[PDB]
Amino acid sequence: PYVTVKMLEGRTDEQKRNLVEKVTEAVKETTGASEEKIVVFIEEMRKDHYAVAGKRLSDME
Amino acid sequence: PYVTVKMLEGRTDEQKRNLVEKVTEAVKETTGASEEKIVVFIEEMRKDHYAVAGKRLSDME
Amino acid sequence: PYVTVKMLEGRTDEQKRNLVEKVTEAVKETTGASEEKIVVFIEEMRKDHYAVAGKRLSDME
Amino acid sequence: PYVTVKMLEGRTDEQKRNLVEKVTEAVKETTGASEEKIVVFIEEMRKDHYAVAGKRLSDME
Amino acid sequence: PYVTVKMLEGRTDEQKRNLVEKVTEAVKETTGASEEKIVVFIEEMRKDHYAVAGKRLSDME
Amino acid sequence: PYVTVKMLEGRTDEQKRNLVEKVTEAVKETTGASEEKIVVFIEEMRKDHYAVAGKRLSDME
Ligand SMILES: O=C([O-])/C(F)=C\c1ccc(O)cc1
Ligand SMILES: O=C([O-])/C(F)=C\c1ccc(O)cc1
Ligand SMILES: O=C([O-])/C(F)=C\c1ccc(O)cc1
C-alpha cells in the first residue's frame, strides 16, 4: 500500500517521523498488508499554492 | 491534511471503514490537525496494472 | 498546463463538457497559456472511497 | 471537488491568485458543487523536470 | 523509483506487459536503480475524461 | 501518455536527461503512442519525506 500525506508546511521533523510510524501502523492493522510493503510519501504544501472556496490560504487571516 | 491510500483491490467494505478511521486518528494525533480538516481518499489498483522488477503482479508465478 | 479535477461520480456528460470548457478558459485567461497547451483530466470518486473526519461519505447518516 | 493545476514556474503571485478564483468559479458553475467544497492545489514544474517527445524543456530553445 | 504511466484505454494485455518491462529497463539503465526497487503503475483514462484545448477526446470530430 | 517518474534526490542532470529519452522511447515502442504525445514528469523525493515499513529513509543507515 502506498500512502501519500499531503499537508501544509509547518510540521516539525519529529511530527513527520511520528506521522509515518502511526499511519504505517494504521494501514498494517486494517488492511492485512505486510509492514515492508507499506510505503509513505509526505508532500508539503505552501499556503500560496493551496486554496479553499476560491481563496488561497496565504490570502486569509 | 489529505491522505491518499493506494492499494490492490480486495479489501472488504469493513476493512476500508477501519482504514479510514485509523488513518484519520493517526494523522490527528501526530500532526495536531482537527478531524474535520482530515480527508482520506482510497484508490484501488488492479494486479495487471501494478508491477515490480518489470513483472506485473498478474504475471508472477 | 495540466488540470486534474477530482470529483464524486454523478455529473452528467453535459456537465463534464462544460467543466472542461470553462476550466480551460479560466486557465487561458489567467495564465496566458494557449488553448492547445491546456490539458484537463477528470477523475471520479466513489462515495465509499472518500472520507472526511474519519467517515466515508457512504457511511454518513 | 479537488483541482490540481500543474504548470511551469514563471507565473506571478497575482496570476496564481486569479487562477484560483477563476478555476474555482468555473467548477462551481458547471458541477453544482458548493463553493466551500472546491479545493485548488497549484503544483509548479521545473523545465528540467518536464519533457515532451523525449526532450526536456530545459534542453529546448 | 516509482513510475506511473497514464494512458487512454485500449492497449492489449501484451502491450502492457511490454510497457512494464521496457520502462523498468529504461529506469534501471539510466538511474542505476536495482530492478527490485523499480515499481510501475499503469493508469487508464476514458476518452470522455481527457481533454485538450477545451475539447474532450470523446467530443472531437 | 503521461509518465511521472518519482525518485529520490541524488541523480545528475545527465541521468535525468537520459531517463527522459529512454522512458519516452520505451513507451513509444510498446504502446504505439506518437512521440510528440509522450510527456514525462520527474518528481524528486527527499529522504525525510519517504518511508518504508514505518521508517523514513532519513532515519536509516
Ligand atoms: O493543516 C493541514 O495540514 C491541511 F492540509 C489543511 C488545512 C485546511 C484548512 C484549514 O483551516 C486548516 C488546515
Ligand atoms: O505553460 C505551462 O504552464 C505548461 F504546463 C506547459 C507547456 C507545454 C508546452 C509548451 O510549449 C508551453 C507550455
Ligand atoms: O532510488 C530511488 O530512486 C527510489 F525511488 C527508491 C528506493 C527505495 C528503497 C531503496 O532501498 C532504494 C531506493
Side-chain angles (χ1 to χ4, degrees), chain C residues 1-2 31 33, chain D residues 6-8 11 45 50 52 57 60:
Chain C
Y2 302 86
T31 72
Chain D
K6 179 180 289 300
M7 57 183 188
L8 288 174
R11 274 74 186 198
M45 299 182 284
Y50 177 53
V52 183
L57 265 58
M60 287 167 65

Side-chain angles (χ1 to χ4, degrees), chain E residues 1-7 11 15-16 18-20 22-23 26-27 30-33 45 50 52, chain F residues 1-7 11 15-16 18-20 22-23 26-27 29-33 45 50 52:
Chain E
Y2 302 86
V3 186
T4 298
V5 183
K6 187 169 189 181
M7 63 185 179
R11 277 66 190 201
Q15 288 181 297
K16 294 174 189 180
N18 296 159
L19 170 59
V20 160
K22 293 296 191 300
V23 161
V27 171
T30 206
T31 72
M45 305 179 277
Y50 175 66
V52 179
Chain F
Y2 299 81
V3 180
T4 299
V5 182
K6 179 180 289 300
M7 57 183 188
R11 274 74 186 198
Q15 285 177 299
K16 292 177 183 181
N18 298 328
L19 169 70
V20 167
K22 266 56 180 180
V23 166
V27 170
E29 77 188 21
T30 60
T31 68
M45 299 182 284
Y50 177 53
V52 183

